[PDB]
Amino acid sequence: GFDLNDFLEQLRQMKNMGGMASLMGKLPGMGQIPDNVKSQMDDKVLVRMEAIINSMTMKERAKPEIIKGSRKRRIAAGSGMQVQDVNRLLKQFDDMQRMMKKMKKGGMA
């Protein structure tokens, strides 16, 4: 019930502030330097991640376990990133599907 198609929309729905004042403050107890590392000027990676997804086909966006080196060396060629860059997105996404399945009401405790 979740995939890249839905995960991508979550990025476009960031039109309104996108968290420039929200997520930026969702960490009162900053770990010396956690903020800037997350936002990253809001373009260092926050934008790249989207571009990498835009260069993906409807099939890849639907099934994340069907992408190989033949597809990784293609997305980076169009987006402009590298091979490891595209891999990071898949990794961070793998930990998302596992989290968006073990909860119900908020998932708090």
Binding site: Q10, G19, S22, L23, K26, K38, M96, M99, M100, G106, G107
Partner: peptide, 8 residues
Amino acid sequence: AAAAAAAA
């Protein structure tokens, strides 16, 4: 809460 989880 969607931004308090996907970003958490």
